[PDB]
Structure formats: structure tokens, C-alpha cells
Ligand binder design. Structure first.
Ligand SMILES: *[C@@H]1O[C@H](CO)[C@@H](O[C@@H]2O[C@H](CO)[C@@H](O)[C@H](O)[C@H]2NC(C)=O)[C@H](O)[C@H]1NC(C)=O
Ligand SMILES: *[C@@H]1O[C@H](CO)[C@@H](O[C@@H]2O[C@H](CO)[C@@H](O)[C@H](O)[C@H]2NC(C)=O)[C@H](O)[C@H]1NC(C)=O
Ligand SMILES: Clc1ccc(C[C@H]2CCCN2C2CCN(c3ccccn3)CC2)cc1
Ligand SMILES: Clc1ccc(C[C@H]2CCCN2C2CCN(c3ccccn3)CC2)cc1
Ligand SMILES: [Cl-]
Lengths: 362, 361
């Protein structure tokens, strides 16, 4: 089973124990670690952070004691110009030079492959996307033609029905990508102005949601339906939760909200919490397991957060193995309790270790 | 059969032949004409346009030479803060004041009843809605007790399953409403694609985003939920919803970049009055959607779904099969009231089609 785990470069900047560097990662924990994100410097694959070239090294020396560990470089992101991905994907010369430039970069900095993180291609850029991947795979074979171990190519694809419809030719692109990663989180299935879980496994209660689309189960099934082979499907499990400030006093799913949750001390972004911040939050909080969705939320005062714990990630890995998917994708390593200092037991990476155990178990 | 027809006061302001006043309304066309909309101010029902009293009189004059015609005043609309209506309905004092104020107002200005057009009650408002409808119906009963012709009470209810589930207690409120007008248009059925806003049936199954975005599902659902057929009036639009096409695909589900170009008179992107559509049909190609029994028109990069005489004949046939109370029309001023744009100088071609289709056997 594949275990694809993202590391974010900007996570190096968090205060105190929140600071995460590629040397703090377990080299046996994941099968695939994806550095995010690499930039586009006018049609060339460039670096993003000043010390990227350094952290690249910091990550890839983890391959010294583990050979089967494979690393990829994610180009794109969401704070990256989407139009600055389109205008570079629609001109033939631009695509040519970028594709030619990717393999020398990946070899210079010791990456095993490339991960496409375009969030998100429009309708006007759907077809181009396809051909992009088609050519991006092609050159790779050429680069590996002189008896070299060929580079990997992956794409992180949206899990919302509208976006998959408007941007992906899943059937065609599934033959050229080594694996696809379904971002089965950040769902917005809650009633307007009400609490809801951003990563439910199933729909759960029928009349407590507008659509049966905003959940992991439907997204995985739809992906399979549109031609993606399960052998190349990696299901995303979040090591973060989405939070709200309760407006009235109710605290169940569908309770009114006055806005996003209070920011975490380290991640500092309203409406989100890292799992270790959640473990802090759990002190004095009440945990409820949403019956139909197989995932927990925690409430405490006027705060409400939907997240994943060891139990729920075990359930998600079970759903994965049933569907005979390729494995699990984790966003992201630096959001798990990587230091082990928040969720007790002095144990590092509790969520990702639960995922790996559940994958290896029988 | 009831024929409920809405007149909108703001149509008085449209340019040229689009200007529509109540004296342009055929006094024999409909069985009920509802004036839209009335305001709520200081928890009293009140006028909205500066000349509402005059226009009330122009409308209620049509009863002199036609005693059988009834008129109602519609309170609400979509430019009325549902926040406000919620405050009035939940606050007991505001609610009682509004209720007490309605009958003297309707009597003073010559109306036969009230139409409730709260668009829309929230989840938290559903029960409030019921209470309102109940107590209002009681007040009328009290005001009419000494041998008076009781005021009517009606409501315009969404045809959207989600809205119906969160907002209305159909079985309770249909006990007190004299009729329910179900707004079977403006249907939201896949993003970025053309689609008919008032299809009769679901049509081709794999071309439908869902099962509930059509007239037939809404009618059957509100029947299922306890609304009697004898109290159900089915909405038929004299307008079309328009899109601007992104490609050479012109069928149902073709990609779009946004709402259609505004009409010359109605000046609202994504909508077109029926007489505007008649102007648009000149040089256009019309396709009847097989499964959905409604037409759409296309020309250049423009695509509009709407109703014509054939489709409203079919919709009337449906509602008669279902033994409903009749048809509701939004709106009189969007039909070709001048008779100039469509047909052969026939006034109200769509509404007259509906009326004749109701009259047949
Ligand atoms: C990522 O690459 C883009 C494209 O080269 C960079 O965007 C440029 O930013 C500079 C400074 O803000 C501007 O003067 C240029 O006009 C931008 N160029 C384009 C094409 O948009 C961006 O600086 C790079 N980001 C990082 C972190 O390296
Ligand atoms: C409908 O009635 C409401 C409620 O009184 C009116 O809202 C007020 O409008 C005045 C005039 O500008 C404002 O100064 C007040 O602040 C508004 N009050 C509230 C509570 O919103 C509204 O103007 C009336 N509309 C019409 C067309 O008569
Ligand atoms: Cl505490 C915290 C935790 C998480 C976030 C960011 C989340 C929430 C908003 C969007 N964001 C997701 C992350 C994964 N997304 C992916 C995944 C894989 C590949 C590419 N993009 C893109 C959107 C901020 C603060
Ligand atoms: Cl040319 C033109 C034609 C029609 C419109 C308005 C349509 C379209 C958007 C919403 N709107 C409907 C009409 C009927 N609606 C009703 C019906 C009955 C009772 C109460 N409200 C409320 C929503 C604008 C311009
Ligand atoms: Cl149902």
C-alpha cells in the first residue's frame, strides 16, 4: 500500500514547537513524501522559498537509511497564481520549455518525480491539462531511456463534484499519471451558516445536508466511475480540522454559526486547526462521533471543530482497503503532532502512524 | 378552475410599450388578480409604491363590470427583508399588530383577500410561518362573522424541495389557506450549463442534475406532504430564463459563461418577458425538449428557456389530470399585454391560452 505524505515549506516558519523542518520527519513512516510547493518562474520550474535548495537536501538525505522511500516535488498550490498556471499551460512553447526543464531540476535536487497541484484548472483549461500530463509523462520516458530509473508523475485532484466535472478528463489522464490523489477534505456540505464536517467518510443522515456529494465516499466512487483505476487512486485524509464559532447555543451538526473558528496559536488561520492544536483544544472539550459520517467533532464554549482522530483514520483506511485503492494521502505531515508533545503518549505523528498501522494491518 | 394572475406595480415604470398599469388588464381573463407587492411598516401592512392607492383603485375598478372577479394584495416579495418578515412573524406583538391591521387595510382599499409572499421563511422560521397563517386565518374569520363575505387567505410557496422541507409545514398550513400557489418556475436544474427553469417533467434521466427540479416533482411532493389538490394552484411563467452560450453547443446542458443578455424593457440579465421572447424569436430556432414538454429558443450566443401556447396547454392538461384548483401566472405584465409583439394583435396570448385550456373538456 502507498502512503503519500505532503510536507509544506512554509511550515518551517511557525513559532516555537510549530516550526517543522524536513529533518523532523520519520523516513520510514511514509512511502512517498511530497515537497510543496515549487514555483513557476516564467515557464521554468523554479524554487519558492529562499532555503528550498537546502530543505530539498534536508528531505532527501532521509533516503540514505531508507531506499524504498520516494520523494516528489509539488508544483502549484492555492496561493499561487491560477492564471499564472493557465497562461503557461495554453501556449505550446511554454509547455515545451517547462516540460523540458522539469527533469533537470528533479535530478539536480534529487527528487524521484513531480506532483501537479493546479488548484484549479477551469473549463477553459480542462483539455490543455490533459495534453499537459500526456506530454509531461512522455519526456520522462525519454529522460529514462538510457537505462535510468524513470521519474514519477502525480496529480492532486479536487474531490468536489462540480470541479471534477468542469476540469478533469479522468479517463484519459488516468493512463498517463502514475497515481492520483483525491483531496477528500475541505468539503462544504453544511447548511449555509451552520456547522458541518469538512471530511466525512459517508453522507450520513439524509435530511441534514443539501447534497450527497460533499463526502469522501461519493468522491471516491465518482472518481472510479469516470475511469480512474483504483490501482492509481490515493485517498486524502486530513491531519487538520475545520472550525466555526457557534452563533446560538446549539452544538450539533447543523447548529448556527457566526463565522469561522478562532485561529490556532501556531497555524494562525481562522477556521482551521492543526491536529496538535486540536489535541490542545480537546482538553476540556466534548467529542462527538457523528453517527453516519464516521468522524468526530469537538465542541467547547463557542468553538466547534470537525477533524479526524486515530479511530476515524482507521475507518477511512478500512474504506480504502475495501475499495482496493492504491493507498492513503496525508495533508500534511507538519500538521500532525510531529513532535509528539501535544497529544500525550510522547508519541510522534499519531495520526499518520495510525494510518500506516491500519494500512499494514490485517 | 381558478386562474390566479399576478400584477407587479413596478411594471408601471418600464419604458414605452413595456409600461403596464392595472387598467391594461383584461377584466375577464383571470378568476383572481393579485397585486404585488405590499410592505410591512411599523408592523402594519402598508403601501409600497407612491401611487399604490391609485393603482389599487385602477385594479379594483375591473370588478364593476365583472362581479365574479376577486382581487388579493400580496405582501412580501424578494426585495423585502426576510430578516424583517421573520422579526414580524416571531415577535408576538408585531405579529398581532400586523394581523389586526390587515383586514381594515384590505377593506379600505377594496381587496378581497391577502396573499402571503414570504420569500422565504428560514429553518428557524418554519413554525412561526404556521402560526402566522393560523392566526391570520382566525382574524379574517372574526372580521367576517357578522354575515360578511370572508376575506381570502393565500400563500405563494416555493417549488424547491430543500426550501419546502426547511420552510413549510404543508399539512398544517394548507388547513388554513384558501389556496396555495406553488411557484413551479425558476428551477435550478448542472452548473455552467443551459437548462429549462420551468420543465413539466424530469425528462431525459442522465441529463438531469436531480429528480426534484421540475414541475411534476414539486406538485407531487406537495400533494404527498398533505396539501389538498382542490387547494393547489400550479405556477406557470410568462417569462423565460436566459443564458449566454460558451460554444456552438445549443442543446440542454450546453456550457455557458453566464446569464443571458438583458431584455430591452425588463433590463435584467438572465430573464426575459414573454413578449421580449417573441421579439427574440424573430430569426431564432425553437426546440421542444422531448422529455420536458417545454420549448427553448436559441440564436447566436443566446439561449432562453420559456413557455409558449403549446407548453402551457400541456401544463394545464397536467394540472387538470391531477385535479388541481387551477393555474397561477407570473406575471400579467410579462405576457404580451399590448398584443403587439406576438401573434396577430392578440392580447395576453399566454394567459388566454391558459384560460382556454382550462375551459376545454
Ligand atoms: C514565483 O514566480 C513568479 C513568476 O516569475 C514570480 O512572480 C513575479 O513576482 C515579482 C515580484 O512580486 C513581480 O515583479 C513579477 O512581475 C512577477 N512575475 C510574474 C510573471 O507574475 C514570484 O515572485 C515567484 N515567487 C517566489 C516565491 O519565488
Ligand atoms: C417598508 O417599510 C419599512 C419598515 O418601516 C421601511 O424601512 C425603513 O425605511 C426608512 C426610509 O429610508 C429608513 O429610514 C428606515 O431605516 C427603514 N426601517 C427599517 C426597519 O428598515 C421601508 O422603507 C418601507 N419601504 C417602502 C417601499 O415603503
Ligand atoms: Cl491549520 C491549517 C490546515 C490546512 C490549511 C489549508 C487547507 C484548508 C484551506 C485549504 N487547504 C487545503 C489543504 C490541502 N490542499 C491540497 C492538498 C494536496 C495537494 C494540493 N493541495 C489545498 C487546500 C490551513 C491551515
Ligand atoms: Cl423579465 C423578468 C421575469 C421574472 C423576473 C423575476 C423572477 C426571476 C427571478 C425571480 N423571479 C421570480 C418570479 C416569481 N416569484 C414569485 C411568484 C409568485 C409569488 C411570489 N413571488 C418570485 C421569483 C424578473 C424579470
Ligand atoms: Cl423524496
Amino acid at each position: 500500500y502507498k502512503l503519500v505524505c505532503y510536507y509544506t515549506s512554509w511550515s518551517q516558519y511557525r513559532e516555537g514547537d510549530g516550526s517543522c523542518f524536513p529533518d523532523a520527519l520519520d523516513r520510514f513512516l511514509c512511502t512517498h513524501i511530497i515537497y510543496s510547493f515549487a514555483n513557476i518562474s516564467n515557464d521554468h520550474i523554479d524554487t519558492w522559498e529562499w532555503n528550498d535548495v537546502t530543505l530539498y537536501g534536508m528531505l532527501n538525505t532521509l533516503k540514505n537509511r531508507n531506499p524504498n522511500l520516494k520523494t516528489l516535488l509539488s508544483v502549484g498550490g492555492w496561493n499561487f497564481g491560477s492564471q499564472r498556471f493557465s497562461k503557461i499551460a495554453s501556449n505550446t512553447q511554454s509547455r515545451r520549455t517547462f516540460i523540458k526543464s522539469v527533469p533537470p531540476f528533479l535530478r539536480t535536487h534529487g527528487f524521484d518525480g513531480l506532483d501537479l497541484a493546479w488548484l484549479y484548472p477551469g473549463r477553459r483549461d480542462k483539455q490543455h491539462f490533459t495534453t499537459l500530463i500526456k506530454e509531461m509523462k512522455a519526456e520522462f520516458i525519454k529522460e529514462a531511456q538510457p537505462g535510468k530509473k524513470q521519474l514519477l508523475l502525480s496529480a492532486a485532484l479536487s474531490a468536489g463534484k462540480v470541479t471534477i466535472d468542469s476540469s478533469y478528463d479522468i479517463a484519459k489522464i488516468s493512463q498517463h499519471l502514475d497515481f492520483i490523489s483525491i483531496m477528500t477534505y475541505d468539503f462544504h456540505g453544511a447548511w449555509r451558516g451552520t456547522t458541518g464536517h469538512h471530511s466525512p467518510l459517508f453522507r450520513g443522515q439524509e435530511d441534514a445536508s443539501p447534497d450527497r456529494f460533499s463526502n469522501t465516499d461519493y468522491a471516491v466512487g465518482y472518481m472510479l466511475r469516470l475511469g480512474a483505476p483504483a490501482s492509481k487512486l490515493v485517498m486524502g485524509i486530513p491531519t487538520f480540522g475545520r472550525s466555526f464559532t457557534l452563533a446560538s447555543s446549539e452544538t450539533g451538526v447543523g447548529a448556527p454559526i457566526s463565522g469561522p473558528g478562532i485561529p490556532g496559536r501556531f497555524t494562525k488561520e481562522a477556521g482551521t486547526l492543526a491536529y496538535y492544536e486540536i489535541c490542545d483544544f480537546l482538553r476540556g472539550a466534548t467529542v462527538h462521533r457523528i453517527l453516519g459520517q464516521q468522524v468526530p467533532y469537538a465542541t467547547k464554549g463557542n468553538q466547534w471543530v470537525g477533524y479526524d482522530d486515530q479511530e476515524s483514520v482507521k475507518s477511512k483506511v478500512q474504506y480504502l482497503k475495501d475499495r482496493q485503492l492504491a493507498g492513503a494521502m496525508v495533508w500534511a505531515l507538519d500538521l500532525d503532532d510531529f513532535q509528539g508533545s501535544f497529544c500525550g503518549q510522547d508519541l510522534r505523528f499519531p495520526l499518520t502512524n495510525a494510518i500506516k498501522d491500519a494500512l499494514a494491518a490485517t
